[PDB]
Amino acid sequence: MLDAFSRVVVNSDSKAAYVGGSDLQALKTFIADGNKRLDAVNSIVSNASCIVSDAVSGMICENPGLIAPGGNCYTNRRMAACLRDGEIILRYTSYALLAGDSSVLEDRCLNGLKETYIALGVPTNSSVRAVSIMKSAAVAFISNTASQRKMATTDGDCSALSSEVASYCDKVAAAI
Amino acid sequence: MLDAFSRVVVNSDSKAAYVGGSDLQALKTFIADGNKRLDAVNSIVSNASCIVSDAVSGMICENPGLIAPGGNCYTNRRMAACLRDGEIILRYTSYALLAGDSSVLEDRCLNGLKETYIALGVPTNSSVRAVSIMKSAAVAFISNTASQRKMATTDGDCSALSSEVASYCDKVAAAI
Amino acid sequence: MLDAFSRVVVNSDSKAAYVGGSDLQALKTFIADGNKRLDAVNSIVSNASCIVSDAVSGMICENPGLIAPGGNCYTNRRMAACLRDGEIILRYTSYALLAGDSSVLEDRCLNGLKETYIALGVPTNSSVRAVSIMKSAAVAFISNTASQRKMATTDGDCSALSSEVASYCDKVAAAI
Amino acid sequence: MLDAFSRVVVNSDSKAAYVGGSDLQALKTFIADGNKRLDAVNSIVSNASCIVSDAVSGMICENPGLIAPGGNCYTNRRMAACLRDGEIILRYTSYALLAGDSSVLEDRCLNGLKETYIALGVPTNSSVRAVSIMKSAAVAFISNTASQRKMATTDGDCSALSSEVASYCDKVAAAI
Amino acid sequence: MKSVITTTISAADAAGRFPSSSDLESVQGNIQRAASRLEAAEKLAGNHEAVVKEAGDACFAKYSYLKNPGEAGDSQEKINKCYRDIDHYMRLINYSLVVGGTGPLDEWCIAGAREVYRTLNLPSSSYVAAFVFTRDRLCVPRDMSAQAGVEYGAALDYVINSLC
Amino acid sequence: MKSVITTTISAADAAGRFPSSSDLESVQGNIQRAASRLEAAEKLAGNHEAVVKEAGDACFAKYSYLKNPGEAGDSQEKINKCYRDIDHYMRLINYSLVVGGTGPLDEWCIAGAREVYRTLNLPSSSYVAAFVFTRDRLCVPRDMSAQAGVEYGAALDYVINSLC
Amino acid sequence: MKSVITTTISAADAAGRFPSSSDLESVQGNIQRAASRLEAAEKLAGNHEAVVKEAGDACFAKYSYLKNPGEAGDSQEKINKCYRDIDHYMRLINYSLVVGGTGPLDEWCIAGAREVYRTLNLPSSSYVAAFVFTRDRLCVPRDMSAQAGVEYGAALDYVINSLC
Amino acid sequence: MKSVITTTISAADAAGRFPSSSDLESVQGNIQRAASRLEAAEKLAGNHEAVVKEAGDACFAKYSYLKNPGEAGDSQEKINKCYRDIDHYMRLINYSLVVGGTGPLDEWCIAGAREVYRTLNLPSSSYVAAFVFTRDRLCVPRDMSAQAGVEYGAALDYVINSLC
Numbered sequence A, B, C, D: 001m002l003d004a005f006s007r008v009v010v011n012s013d014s015k016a017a018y019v020g021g022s023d024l025q026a027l028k029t030f031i032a033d034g035n036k037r038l039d040a041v042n043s044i045v046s047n048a049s050c051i052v053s054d055a056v057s058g059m060i061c062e063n064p065g066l067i068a069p070g071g072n073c074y075t076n077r078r079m080a081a082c083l084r085d086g087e088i089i090l091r092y093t094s095y096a097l098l099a100g101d102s103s104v105l106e107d108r109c110l111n112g113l114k115e116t117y118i119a120l121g122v123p124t125n126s127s128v129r130a131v132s133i134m135k136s137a138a139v140a141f142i143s144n145t146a147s148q149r150k151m152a153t154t155d156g157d158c159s160a161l162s163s164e165v166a167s168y169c170d171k172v173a174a175a176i
Numbered sequence E, F, G, H: 001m002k003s004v005i006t007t008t009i010s011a012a013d014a015a016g017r018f019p020s021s022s023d024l025e026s027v028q029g030n031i032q033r034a035a036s037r038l039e040a041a042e043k044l045a046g047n048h049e050a051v052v053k054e055a056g057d058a059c060f061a062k063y064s065y066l067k068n069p070g071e072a073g074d075s076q077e078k079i080n081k082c083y084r085d086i087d088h089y090m091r092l093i094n095y096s097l098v099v100g101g102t103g104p105l106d107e108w109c110i111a112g113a114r115e116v117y118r119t120l121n122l123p124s125s126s127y128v129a130a131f132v133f134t135r136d137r138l139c140v141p142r143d144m145s146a147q148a149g150v151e152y153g154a155a156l157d158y159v160i161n162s163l164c
């Protein structure tokens, strides 16, 4: 996996070039927003259980056929499977967010996921309803606009970070 | 793998229904013929060596090209391979018969067998001549009509069981 | 592992002797009390959680030093370790009881246990207070004299069985 | 493995006590000398090859019997073995130094080393001549008094650190 | 699906063996105990709704605090699911009594259950309350025969012991 | 020692499980079929010498060439061991009928038997001759009950099938 | 004991490597964030008894049914252990803030905790109640600095998330 | 690409863990030491050609015998590649200073380097000569700040120590 700096270095390398001055100033911007980024990550991981059962309960909320016989959240074993998968995806997008790169999300989690699901019978339109709910639960927590819980941070615009985390959730909703 | 009762339960479950009264009486019929079924299984396994070398010798009997250079029973190594495969299939159909379900025959023995054979070069028209001979060796022993050996059982009609064991042999002859 | 019959056969074998008539009648007594034995096993396993946390809570009850810093039930990790060990021993004595032989208790559970414990630092005087409590919880349930729970069985003397299960618990208290 | 803080926490725990105020101020001293410690580690690892072949060449220097037939640095294979062992020990003492605790040196490197050596035939009086040479090569580099190479650091007294690294080297010379 | 027949067959399959006397005796035991577990199974199947309803009422009687806002009974839809879950469990007990082993309980309701309930805030104790009530409520010979009481009570103890 | 009880217990031990209904039903089957395998076992134990002797005579009748120099019957000590081996096998069948499974046959006489006989020149067919004779010789109801005939004949077929 | 220093060293040990720049930067971060987690740690250590006592009162206020016979608060000894457990957890949070990572919480209280509580009937929710109360009760700048609030609140969320 | 962030994330991924305090402190260290490794990196990138050229001249000054027929400097194309290799290494040091760890050096130039040089007859000592020269040539505060000297000198010692 790569992070923000390794990603700049891989791109510089494809041209056999030392790191541009433009790229250095981008990276020092990355560094300037270091602490906002850490607060972003902290606001997701401190609420991970909330985010994952919100999203799965919601998925089932909008389509109760999932928990009728033959649906993929039917037994306790499949419900627990789905909760684990929600948790796993959220973990790899919190890696992405802390990394500044989607490298690890794509490499260690999304690669072959679409196939695995096709094989198992896991409804993909539903996985992405869950992931899209997690997207909003998460950008709420980042932006500190979640209804039932706040997290004291200093006053600033965290919108670039929220958009980042939403772009990683969309990478997931697209891998399948 | 499933057996007769687990199979009734899986079917009941697909409708989220407790086990019908009709199904219960079918199962108590299964139980009523319990002891005939055990005699059926005993009459196959007590003769397994007979059944398997009858069938393979017969396969070779009707087509001696199998044991000419290039045929698949040519060396001692391939002949012994074929005897093992005869024995294995007979074992999985005696599991089927004792189970009341073809679940274990299909899951642990037939799955990918057709492919494996295509890969190895194993003549499939011949495997099924052998399996079809085993079918008759077996329903003979069940029905106690084998020429050179009898097995003292009480007087009754074991025809449903024989048909069962022939249906499992046909599942094999069809998997390839 | 051996059971009651295999044990008679191993003893017969050491003399190269077919099974004595005396031994056969002992075994038919074993068979006569078959159903009491099954009720014995059922009355332990249906209460296993009760028996194991009774005993461990009691061990700690009589010696609270176990849950002071440095005691072997101190962290959650060690407490849970001890509960697992209680459960394991009870499982191997319910195997013994269902088997009619202590073969499996001695082979798969007690062999090297004393050493393992010496190595880990597990107080052995306390393990056996727990095991001796489990002994009484268990012979209570067998004999149907447990205070807070009864189990409807038919009227008979189950004392030989209780003594059996207490002899297996004593084998444990002696292995260490 | 533990570090300076984990070590304070393990000691606090053996009394079931929150971390004393005295211990907190010790730790903030540890933190105050954080950057000297990093320079200490950097001055060893930037010279590791120097330190290890200095020491082994010196060991052989003072006792050429090691490289006569039958000595333990005789073939290329044994010489290279010894260089690896020098390097390994230096690595575990640079872990110690960066950790503030000898936990990892003792756990992952010294445990059973004396036995292993006794088994192989590795002269222990010589291993420790090498380790004692490495001790001086290292406290030289820390204290920035090495003859043939300097490392620009700011002016300060790094003597507590040097004594630390010498205490870890002595732990090694004592384990055998 | 764990059961006498499946357990025996797959012991033999693991060994490369045809069925032998141990295997045939094992099935014979399945024949002997058939007639009282199927009795339990039919009585349960014939009165599932009343059993489910007494059990759920007993649960919420023991833990009235569950009906508070934030608890797992703070809405009529949630209480109704609670009785639904109890019914799922009793359906699986029905299956367990018909198969002859704890297979159906094991795969279809025990497997994910601690994680699922940890995550939707469903106290383990409430289900234990509902199964203990059902168990103690059974009456011999009123509700079923003695050896069917044994089978029924047994599956209930198994499901109870999976929540301790 | 393979048997209903041992097979079931060690399936459960492999799984970390207490005994459950499958296990108790399995033993119950051991109780049901007990009374006819123990009948076979007692009839066999009560007349072992005459059975062993007819079987060995039948063997050497079928293969008189074994008594030639160089064969496995070229001396009285060797012929006597032959009948001894047959007795060993029938003792193990006695054990197999008492345990309820083929355990004793499996470990104590099947395991090394192909290598041992390959090496001491003992034709597999001669033992098959002796067991087939015994099997076909049995007579119901003269020699034992019908379901004990089944058990006895069965262990004999098992030992026969281990030499094919 | 999981921590910046231990995590980094054992990544390098797994690779055969001396410490390098990544490792030294990692410790440098430990230096930067030191001064506010040690502030939380000292405030917690200086007022542990009052925090433990408000948290336990909040727990039994939220779940008064625990004081019923059969519940985990049916005796004064049992209620007192409850507050003891809460204190254990806050001691481990103290450790976690001093080390810099969740190590102490992980090994010393999380590891066996679901099995232990499942078995002694200790509802997971009650501890969650006590930690949520403590978390929300904290007040900046009254009780501690902002970045120490972050550290303290964080360890509490971690321990909360280990009971969901 | 080995670095603080990657090392920490993949320790946590190996454990199934979300990021926690150790991880966030580790990145914070990356923030603190950022500003002097990026200074080294920019000074290196701004004067790479003069550094590469002094280093290669120093190499061939120390080992004039390399210019003999058969050596690795017996042609102008070969000497020019030598300076090219030195530039590759300094580009990778630039990367190493920007990432914060030795990743780029590790994968892109250390990995095959002993085999490659063994096979094209490139003495290890010549590169060591060129990096030692560069290292000792650096001048504080002329060429860069003190803590950037540390970073630059450090990557050079790392690459040197990979050729011993």
Ligand SMILES: *CCC1=C(C)C(=O)NC1Cc1[nH]c(/C=C2\N=C(C[C@H]3NC(=O)C(CC)=C3C)C(C)=C2CCC(=O)O)c(CCC(=O)O)c1C
Binding pocket: A034, A035, A036, A037, A038, A039, A040, A042, A142, A143, A144, A153, A154, A155, A156, A157, A158, A161, G033, G146, G147, G150, H024, H025, H028
């Ligand atoms: C994500 C945006 C948030 C929105 C909701 C908002 O309105 N204010 C926000 C966050 C934010 N944080 C800072 C600055 C800091 N964040 C800090 C904590 C993180 N740095 C760390 O080392 C750790 C983990 C170990 C973190 C969790 C810190 C320490 C700072 C700097 C000083 C402080 O605020 O206490 C800003 C900008 C303020 C700034 O000076 O950068 C914003 C907007």
Ligand SMILES: *CCC1=C(C)C(=O)NC1Cc1[nH]c(/C=C2\N=C(C[C@H]3NC(=O)C(CC)=C3C)C(C)=C2CCC(=O)O)c(CCC(=O)O)c1C
Binding pocket: B034, B035, B036, B037, B038, B039, B040, B042, B142, B143, B144, B153, B154, B155, B156, B157, B158, B161, E024, E025, E028, F033, F146, F147, F150
């Ligand atoms: C398969 C049909 C056979 C044909 C060839 C026939 O004409 N008679 C046949 C078989 C048959 N068996 C029974 C009843 C029993 N079979 C028994 C042995 C099996 N039960 C076991 O437990 C064991 C293994 C451990 C078996 C091998 C037994 C014990 C019985 C019951 C009593 C007995 O016959 O000795 C029947 C019907 C007779 C009945 O009462 O069911 C038939 C037709």
Ligand SMILES: *CCC1=C(C)C(=O)NC1Cc1[nH]c(/C=C2\N=C(C[C@H]3NC(=O)C(CC)=C3C)C(C)=C2CCC(=O)O)c(CCC(=O)O)c1C
Binding pocket: C034, C035, C036, C037, C038, C039, C040, C042, C142, C143, C144, C153, C154, C155, C156, C157, C158, C161, E033, E146, E147, E150, F024, F025, F028
């Ligand atoms: C352990 C002694 C008990 C004491 C506490 C007592 O006062 N009565 C007791 C038990 C007991 N049970 C029987 C007979 C049976 N037990 C049966 C159930 C078990 N047999 C099985 O197959 C199964 C599992 C699959 C069991 C759990 C059964 C079926 C019987 C036989 C008929 C019956 O009682 O329903 C006795 C003696 C009565 C007898 O006829 O043997 C006693 C004393």
Ligand SMILES: *CCC1=C(C)C(=O)NC1Cc1[nH]c(/C=C2\N=C(C[C@H]3NC(=O)C(CC)=C3C)C(C)=C2CCC(=O)O)c(CCC(=O)O)c1C
Binding pocket: D034, D035, D036, D037, D038, D039, D040, D042, D142, D143, D144, D153, D154, D155, D156, D157, D158, D161, G024, G025, G028, H033, H146, H147, H150
């Ligand atoms: C070990 C003692 C040395 C002896 C030989 C001496 O006479 N001067 C010495 C070392 C020393 N260093 C500092 C302070 C710093 N060291 C720094 C580098 C390390 N901190 C890091 O983050 C990194 C790795 C990533 C290090 C290698 C830094 C940055 C400082 C602080 C500012 C600076 O000096 O550039 C001191 C004391 C000076 C102080 O203010 O603490 C001494 C004595």
Ligand SMILES: *[C@H](C)C1=C(C)C(=O)N[C@H]1Cc1[nH]c(/C=C2\N=C(C[C@H]3NC(=O)C(CC)=C3C)C(C)=C2CCC(=O)O)c(CCC(=O)O)c1C
Binding pocket: C056, C059, C066, C071, C072, C073, C078, C079, C081, C082, C083, C085, C086, C088, C089, C108, C109, C110, C113, C116, C120, C122, C123, C124, C126, C127, C128, C130
């Ligand atoms: C419980 C009654 C005991 C009291 C006394 C006590 O203070 N601690 C108790 C028990 C305990 N047991 C362990 C760790 C092990 N126990 C082992 C044996 C069991 N493992 C098995 O598979 C079986 C059956 C065959 C047995 C009987 C083994 C092995 C271990 C080591 C593996 C492990 O889980 O640690 C401990 C923990 C000691 C520690 O600090 O690790 C305790 C406290």
Ligand SMILES: *[C@H](C)C1=C(C)C(=O)N[C@H]1Cc1[nH]c(/C=C2\N=C(C[C@H]3NC(=O)C(CC)=C3C)C(C)=C2CCC(=O)O)c(CCC(=O)O)c1C
Binding pocket: D056, D059, D066, D071, D072, D073, D078, D079, D081, D082, D083, D085, D086, D088, D089, D108, D109, D110, D113, D116, D120, D122, D123, D124, D126, D127, D128, D130
């Ligand atoms: C070097 C200073 C010593 C002098 C004195 C000498 O004469 N020989 C020296 C060293 C030496 N070490 C081995 C072989 C082993 N060393 C082992 C321990 C190290 N391996 C590790 O992983 C670690 C760290 C945890 C340690 C410290 C082990 C193990 C071996 C055996 C494996 C092996 O590579 O042989 C030898 C070679 C002895 C022989 O003839 O094989 C020597 C000469």
Ligand SMILES: *[C@H](C)C1=C(C)[C@@H](CC2=N/C(=C\c3[nH]c(C[C@@H]4NC(=O)C(C)=C4[C@H](*)C)c(C)c3CCC(=O)O)C(CCC(=O)O)=C2C)NC1=O
Binding pocket: A050, A051, A054, A055, A057, A058, A059, A061, A062, A132, A133, A136, A137, A138, A140, A141, A146, A147, A148, A149
């Ligand atoms: C059924 C229709 C239904 C379910 C059960 C939910 C599905 C859902 N959740 C959405 C957003 C969301 N979830 C959370 C976490 C949650 N909110 C809190 O304040 C805390 C604490 C928790 C733990 C329960 C958050 C923060 C959000 C943020 C957005 C919001 O409006 O609250 C959501 C919206 C998706 C979208 O924007 O399209 C859905 C559908 N919600 C239901 O209605």
Ligand SMILES: *[C@H](C)C1=C(C)[C@@H](CC2=N/C(=C\c3[nH]c(C[C@@H]4NC(=O)C(C)=C4[C@H](*)C)c(C)c3CCC(=O)O)C(CCC(=O)O)=C2C)NC1=O
Binding pocket: B050, B051, B054, B055, B057, B058, B059, B061, B062, B132, B133, B136, B137, B138, B140, B141, B146, B147, B148, B149
């Ligand atoms: C070559 C043409 C030839 C071979 C060698 C045989 C192939 C064959 N066997 C068939 C049926 C069969 N085999 C057995 C087992 C056998 N019979 C016994 O009585 C005993 C003992 C043994 C061991 C040798 C049985 C029981 C049967 C039953 C049917 C029968 O007629 O005996 C068979 C018929 C297949 C069919 O029905 O199409 C074939 C072709 N037979 C040969 O002729």
Ligand SMILES: *[C@H](C)C1=C(C)[C@@H](CC2=N/C(=C\c3[nH]c(C[C@@H]4NC(=O)C(C)=C4[C@H](*)C)c(C)c3CCC(=O)O)C(CCC(=O)O)=C2C)NC1=O
Binding pocket: C050, C051, C054, C055, C057, C058, C059, C061, C062, C132, C133, C136, C137, C138, C140, C141, C146, C147, C148, C149
């Ligand atoms: C502290 C001194 C204390 C603890 C907590 C207990 C230790 C203990 N239990 C003994 C026997 C025992 N435990 C059970 C299971 C229990 N009883 C029930 O009715 C049910 C249901 C359960 C689940 C909680 C039983 C059945 C028994 C049987 C004997 C009895 O008197 O109840 C016990 C006695 C050991 C002995 O005989 O020396 C001890 C010490 N008990 C405590 O007092």
Ligand SMILES: *[C@H](C)C1=C(C)[C@@H](CC2=N/C(=C\c3[nH]c(C[C@@H]4NC(=O)C(C)=C4[C@H](*)C)c(C)c3CCC(=O)O)C(CCC(=O)O)=C2C)NC1=O
Binding pocket: D050, D051, D054, D055, D057, D058, D059, D061, D062, D132, D133, D136, D137, D138, D140, D141, D146, D147, D148, D149
């Ligand atoms: C044979 C007698 C002989 C060998 C070959 C050496 C053994 C030895 N080295 C001692 C100390 C030492 N080694 C180094 C590393 C070395 N010095 C440098 O400046 C650089 C660069 C390197 C790489 C070669 C150092 C820094 C030191 C520090 C102490 C010193 O006096 O230089 C040493 C002394 C051990 C002691 O104090 O008892 C020995 C014996 N030395 C030989 O003489």
Ligand SMILES: CCC1=C(C)[C@@H](CC2=N/C(=C\c3[nH]c(CC4NC(=O)C(C)=C4CC)c(C)c3CCC(=O)O)C(CCC(=O)O)=C2C)NC1=O
Binding pocket: E043, E044, E047, E050, E051, E054, E134, E136, E137, E138, E139, E140, E142, E143
């Ligand atoms: C497998 C599913 C099975 C159950 C379990 C039970 C459960 C059950 N028992 C009932 C009915 C019932 N059961 C008893 C118990 C009781 N009475 C006696 O004579 C003996 C000594 C006692 C045994 C302990 C009483 C006293 C009542 C009447 C009390 C009441 O219904 O309120 C009722 C109410 C419906 C009815 O009235 O019929 C139910 C639902 N029924 C089932 O089908």
Ligand SMILES: CCC1=C(C)[C@@H](CC2=N/C(=C\c3[nH]c(CC4NC(=O)C(C)=C4CC)c(C)c3CCC(=O)O)C(CCC(=O)O)=C2C)NC1=O
Binding pocket: F043, F044, F047, F050, F051, F054, F134, F136, F137, F138, F139, F140, F142, F143
């Ligand atoms: C488990 C150990 C068991 C054996 C197996 C048999 C084996 C056996 N049967 C015998 C005796 C015997 N058995 C039969 C068979 C026979 N007779 C009938 O009426 C029916 C229709 C036939 C069943 C097929 C005959 C005809 C004889 C007398 C012929 C003879 O003994 O030479 C004899 C001779 C001893 C004697 O005379 O009693 C032996 C050893 N005995 C055992 O204890």
Ligand SMILES: CCC1=C(C)[C@@H](CC2=N/C(=C\c3[nH]c(CC4NC(=O)C(C)=C4CC)c(C)c3CCC(=O)O)C(CCC(=O)O)=C2C)NC1=O
Binding pocket: G043, G044, G047, G050, G051, G054, G134, G136, G137, G138, G139, G140, G142, G143
């Ligand atoms: C790490 C351990 C830490 C804790 C966590 C807290 C926990 C705490 N706060 C208290 C005390 C306290 N805290 C607040 C909150 C509060 N007040 C404000 O001005 C702002 C806007 C609010 C922040 C949300 C109030 C209002 C009180 C007084 C109310 C009361 O004590 O009953 C008290 C009672 C003891 C006392 O009065 O001092 C405790 C135990 N204390 C600690 O040492």
Ligand SMILES: CCC1=C(C)[C@@H](CC2=N/C(=C\c3[nH]c(CC4NC(=O)C(C)=C4CC)c(C)c3CCC(=O)O)C(CCC(=O)O)=C2C)NC1=O
Binding pocket: H043, H044, H047, H050, H051, H054, H134, H136, H137, H138, H139, H140, H142, H143
């Ligand atoms: C990261 C890339 C970095 C390098 C490394 C250096 C490398 C370097 N230093 C130079 C230049 C240079 N550097 C010194 C050293 C020196 N002088 C002092 O006052 C102190 C006490 C001494 C520090 C030890 C001297 C004395 C000279 C002039 C001598 C000469 O250039 O021939 C020159 C020649 C170009 C020039 O003149 O500017 C180079 C290429 N430059 C870089 O950009």
